[PDB]
Design a protein around this ligand. Structure first.
Ligand code: NI
Ligand code: NI
Lengths: 289, 286
């Protein structure tokens, strides 16, 4: 059974969450995310609590709970000159940071250095700080899927989701792409996304990233589908953040925004009979009174 | 006056053109760097708690020719762009609001903060700058919040003596923050401090004010405090509903102090630029 079937739909039902990651990263990303929710077809998003523009996004989230909002759990900081670290004091989670007190750039350095106990404390602290600011998250997911950097970290992530009775992002392809050669028999109690779609560099470098998203909607099949995007205006802030990092860089993020506010994308939902869903709806199916 | 106590004649027009709030924002970092490179701005200071500190720090550690200090930060004036202490909140709890960010106003800081927490956090900001490779030549004070209470000013003066750095002390700044000169006999007092004012900004005359300041400048140690930044989306987002020293104002600062007009006024008035590093060297030599 695909996940649509597990959620009580027919097997051919094309369920879709159109999900903006990295809200809170930057002012341009906050503004583009908000406008893509209000004026486009994006219907869900998640927030990086450690990041410098978290407060602005937390104010929007607390006052606009109709948009499915989650916590984008953060244990890495991929940018060259724009650096951030944990919510908790460094002395409480010292295995998670480089010599400057910032998160490492790569999953493998996190796997090499981080202690599971520190991961668990810091991810719990990001969720708790979201709650303290009045956010009412409906899901948790993982920036650069760094929770998959070690099986022990994925297990911390699964336990934290159960503790807060929230759904989380799990998917066989994400597992493989972070080098996690697990077996799905351990996931009987969990809901796995059938298909996760995100932009790829080989389309971006042909100038065809927009065409990639059109093709993804054209070819969607029954099951639970998740599109992950990063809408942000390609202005000087974003160029400053994504310097020397064109993969999911500032030009790419603007393409995300434009595609998912277009008439083209909106018509494709209807033409392909795609059924939008949010994590809160999934949460309510899984966690009963 | 300070010009004589630094070894010059009384009529000498010493001037520091000093960019505050470096580290605040990417747009301010870029505008500050460009004004040092291509303007007549000759000094700046860095806000260590701010989100764009690291990028500024990389510039500072590899570009020591530019006089550079630590802009000590105990307040966060902005509506949606919030930052707090370098130290953990549990270690300096009296410095922060319920969100863990610095307060917006010196008055709240003075009502709440313990001088002990002030001393610990200001020390941590200087130490973090040092750890990142910055070799500061001076300290000064964001919104002059070290003047919010006399005990805070004393902390600030002790910290300057401990690191053997010059610091910004001035009677106009004192009376701005609401705070007797004979107590400062072994410290160097700036004779005149110039900063933009809203009454001129709202009439479209901010640059006129700076031009008049250069034309009229008198002998002694003069200090112009500015905040160059590009008036772009990022700065509009930081300075929303805060036009005083807001994004358009900061663009005027950049435009004027990279203009040939300003450089010409320097030549016409025979104003002599000087840095805090030179002042520190001269104090140490005395
Ligand atoms: Ni992410
Ligand atoms: Ni300042």
């Amino acid at each position: 059974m695909n996940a649509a079937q597990k959620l009580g739909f027919t097997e051919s039902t094309k369920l879709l969450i159109i999900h903006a990651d990295d809200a809170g990263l930057a002012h341009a990303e906050n503004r583009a995310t908000i406008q893509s929710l209000q004026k486009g077809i994006v219907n869900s998003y998640s927030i990086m609590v450690p990041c410098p523009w978290f407060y602005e996004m937390a104010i929007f989230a607390k006052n606009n709970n109709q948009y499915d909002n989650g916590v984008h759990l953060t244990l890495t900081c991929e940018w060259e000159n724009y650096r951030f670290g944990p919510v908790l004091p460094i002395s409480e989670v010292p295995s998670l940071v480089d010599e400057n007190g910032y998160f490492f750039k790569k999953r493998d350095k996190l796997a090499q250095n981080a202690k599971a106990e520190h991961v668990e404390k810091e991810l719990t602290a990001q969720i708790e700080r979201a709650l303290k600011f009045g956010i009412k998250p409906t899901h948790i997911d993982s920036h650069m899927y760094s929770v998959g950097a070690k099986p022990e970290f994925l297990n911390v992530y699964r336990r934290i989701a159960k503790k807060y009775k929230l759904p989380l992002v799990l998917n066989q392809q994400l597992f493989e792409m972070v080098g996690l050669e697990m077996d799905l028999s351990d996931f009987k109690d969990e809901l796995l996304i059938d298909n996760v779609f995100m932009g790829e560099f080989k389309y971006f470098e042909k100038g065809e990233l927009a065409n990639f998203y059109a093709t993804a909607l054209d070819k969607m099949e029954g099951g639970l589908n998740l599109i992950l995007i990063h809408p942000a205006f390609d202005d000087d802030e974003m160029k400053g953040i994504t310097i020397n990092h064109p993969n999911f860089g500032s030009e790419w993020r603007q393409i995300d925004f434009d595609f998912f506010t277009s008439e083209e994308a909106q018509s494709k939902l209807k033409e392909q009979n795609i059924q939008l869903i949010t994590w809160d709806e999934i949460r309510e199916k899984i966690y009963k009174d």
